[PDB]
Paper text:
One of the antibodies named NCV2SG48 is highly potent to broad SARS-CoV-2 variants including Omicron BA.1, BA.2, and BA.4/5. To confirm these points, we further performed the X-ray crystal structure analysis of NCV2SG48 Fab in a complex with the Delta and Omicron S-RBD. The binding interface of HC and LC has mostly conserved in Delta and Omicron BA. RBD, suggesting that the extended interaction area caused by the SHMs functioned effectively. Notably, NCV2SG48 neutralized all SARS-CoV-2 variants including BA.1, BA.2, BA.2.12.1, and BA.4/5. NCV2SG48 is from a minor VH but the multiple somatic hypermutations contribute to a markedly extended binding interface and hydrogen bonds to interact with conserved residues at the core receptor-binding motif of RBD, which efficiently neutralizes a broad spectrum of variants. However, we detected none of the escape mutants from seven independent cultures under the presence of NCV1SG23 or NCV2SG48 alone suggesting that these two mAbs are highly resistant to spontaneous mutations.
Residue numbers in the entry:
A (entry chain L): 1 to 214
B (entry chain R): 334 to 527
C (entry chain H): 1 to 132, 137 to 217
């Protein structure tokens, strides 16, 4: 019956900016709308109900407005901890309730370059029959970063997987881990394992490496 | 001795549903057939009796209950329903004998900035019995800490306004409802047709 | 000090059955509107079921006839019985207290339900030892488990600054793997012990791994 459409679907802004998300209802719902903030891994947290009433405890930099079909959530002065996905809900006093699709909000900040570390496979893992090699990029901005595995200078491809944390709530940076997986047999054929990192904050690529057995 | 139906249907003022209005109809002849086809009525449903046949029956008493709900809730005004209206505001019995009449009143009952005069009971502990009218305004206790008549956390005012704006989706627009009940007692009959 | 504490999630074979629980404190469930809401991995919020204090129940179309919401007043607990589970039911399931016109003000922490025919498997945990007086990095590699989730902490919760626990990755084997790392002063490598605490509830695997230089 009611479809709710949020706009934009994602967005980035700097600390101190004024941010506005809109929610559009397919028919007039008059003022029965709530706003929620969801942080990664956490339950949604109520921010606004009846389209403009601040839920108790919620910082006053959050405010809402609108009625009928067009609603807006506003953050007057964005803070690093406001990184989240925000949802609107139709406060229907009969069931069905519905939610918008979500609006992802990320913090813009100044370029930070990553600290890089490489970890050889542990002896316990080798005893089992596999070897993983781990490369860590720590506390960088922005999110785009290139990690190249090199094994005796052969660029490896197809045998690694990476993972990125969600943006940090205080320094607003990211971290990344890349894992090169090999059998023990393949691992012992080679000597120089190395991890080469490209990022906007690095003047030239950084490489961290070790020689197997040192 | 024609029945005072214009007093119900054309009443200038309609009750909130929690405080639903009841009118006793007695000692007259009711010509339902002009209503049945009025087509200004978006709803005309009869239970235990037949429309197109009403003008041929006789009843001990007729009650006309009337109130304002939103059009999406009109389906709850029927036997065997559930929902916030049927459970906590106006409840028909299973063996209901009578008719439900409804119609859009967005032009009368809706205000540009929102009309908040019409209200319904949101918070209640259990379901109403049939034809029960609960007009309590006691603070509703959602936790174990009693409220002492202060509103606050876990302590909620039990009634809420609809907020009828003219921009509302038709399901969220005000409808006026009249419920006729046909009481057939062991006494002489006082309302009949032509 | 209102809290809703969920349980009962985990792994279930397609067409199997499962009961979620939500144990509440700070309000009386039998006196409130209560909902289950669910969120498929990477997706938005979907309303599932609603119970009235008066006892009426309502359901999303996508679960009608398969799910049943109920409660136990003596235990102040809300339940969700799920039958004929299919892959599209895989989600984190939240219970919430509903003030209908005032929004959903309190939510449980969520319980992940994975409907899959794959077997459950506990992780192997391996140290990522610190290398060789500035800032060191050390970590734990949590390898080859199914299903999600695992929890990782450091030094029984005492160490939280500079911890990064990465989102898991599914490997071509069909098993998850992840890393958790922390950066500490180099000068503390000989003087402070570092233990990652790894818990995988679906396999009842508990591992504390000391990470030595
Ligand atoms: C209500 O008033 C209208 C307009 O005057 C009239 O057409 C209608 O018959 C009335 N309904 C009654 C008397 O039930």
């Amino acid at each position: 019956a009611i479809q709710l459409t949020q706009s934009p679907s994602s967005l980035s802004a700097s600390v101190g900016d004024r941010v506005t998300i809109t929610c559009r209802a397919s028919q007039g719902i008059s003022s029965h709308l709530a706003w929620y903030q969801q942080k990664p891994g956490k339950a949604p947290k109520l921010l606004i109900f009846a389209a403009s009433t601040l839920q108790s405890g919620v910082p006053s930099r959050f405010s809402g407005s609108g009625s009928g079909t067009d609603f807006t959530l506003t953050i007057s002065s964005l803070q690093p901890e406001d990184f989240a996905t925000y949802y609107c809900q139709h406060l229907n006093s009969n069931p069905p309730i519905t939610f918008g699709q979500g609006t992802r909000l990320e913090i813009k900040r100044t370029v930070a370059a990553p600290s890089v570390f490489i970890f050889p496979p542990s002896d316990e893992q080798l005893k089992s029959g596999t070897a993983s090699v781990v490369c860590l990029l720590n506390n960088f901005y922005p999110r785009e970063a290139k990690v190249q595995w090199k094994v005796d200078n052969a660029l490896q491809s197809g045998n690694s997987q990476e993972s990125v944390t969600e943006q940090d709530s205080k320094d607003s940076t990211y971290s990344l881990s890349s894992t090169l997986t090999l059998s023990k047999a393949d691992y012992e054929k080679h000597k120089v394992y190395a991890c080469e990192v490209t990022h906007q904050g690095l003047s030239s690529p950084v490489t961290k490496s070790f020689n197997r057995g040192e | 001795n024609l029945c005072p139906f214009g007093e119900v249907f054309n009443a200038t003022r309609f009750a909130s549903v929690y405080a639903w209005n009841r009118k006793r109809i007695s000692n007259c002849v009711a010509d339902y057939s002009v209503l049945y086809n009025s087509a200004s009525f978006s709803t005309f449903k009869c239970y235990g009796v037949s429309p197109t046949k009403l003008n041929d029956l006789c009843f001990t008493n007729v009650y006309a209950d009337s109130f304002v709900i939103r059009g999406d809730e009109v389906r709850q005004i029927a036997p065997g329903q559930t929902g916030k209206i049927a459970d906590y505001n106006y409840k028909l019995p299973d063996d209901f004998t009578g008719c439900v009449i409804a119609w859009n009143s967005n032009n009368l009952d809706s205000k540009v900035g929102g009309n908040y005069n019409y209200r319904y009971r949101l918070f209640r502990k259990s379901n109403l019995k049939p034809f029960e009218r609960d007009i309590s305004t006691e603070i509703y206790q959602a936790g174990s800490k009693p409220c002492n008549g202060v509103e606050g956390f876990n302590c909620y005012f039990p009634l809420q306004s609809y907020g009828f704006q003219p921009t509302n989706g038709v399901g969220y627009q005000p409808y006026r409802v009249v419920v006729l009940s046909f009481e057939l007692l062991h006494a002489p009959a006082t309302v009949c047709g032509p | 000090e209102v809290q809703l504490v969920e349980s009962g999630g985990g792994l279930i074979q397609p067409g199997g059955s499962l009961r979620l629980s939500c144990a509440a404190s700070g309000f009386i469930v039998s006196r409130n509107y209560m909902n289950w809401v669910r969120q498929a991995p990477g997706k938005g919020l979907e309303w599932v079921a609603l119970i009235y204090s008066g006892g009426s129940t309502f359901y999303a179309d996508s679960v009608k006839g398969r799910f049943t919401i109920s409660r136990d007043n003596s235990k102040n607990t809300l339940y969700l019985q799920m039958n004929s589970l299919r892959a599209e039911d895989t989600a984190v399931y939240y219970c919430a207290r509903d003030l209908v016109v005032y929004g959903l003000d309190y939510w449980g922490q969520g319980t992940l339900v994975t409907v899959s025919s794959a077997s459950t498997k506990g992780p192997s945990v391996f140290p990522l030892a610190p290398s060789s007086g500035g800032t060191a990095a050390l970590g734990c590699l949590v390898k080859d488990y199914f299903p999600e989730p695992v929890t990782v902490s450091w030094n029984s919760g005492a160490l939280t600054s500079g911890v990064h626990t990465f989102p898991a990755v599914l490997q071509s084997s069909g098993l998850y793997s992840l890393s958790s790392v922390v950066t500490v002063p180099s000068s503390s490598l000989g003087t402070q012990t570092y233990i990652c605490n790894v818990n995988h509830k679906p396999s009842n695997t508990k591992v504390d791994k000391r990470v030595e230089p």
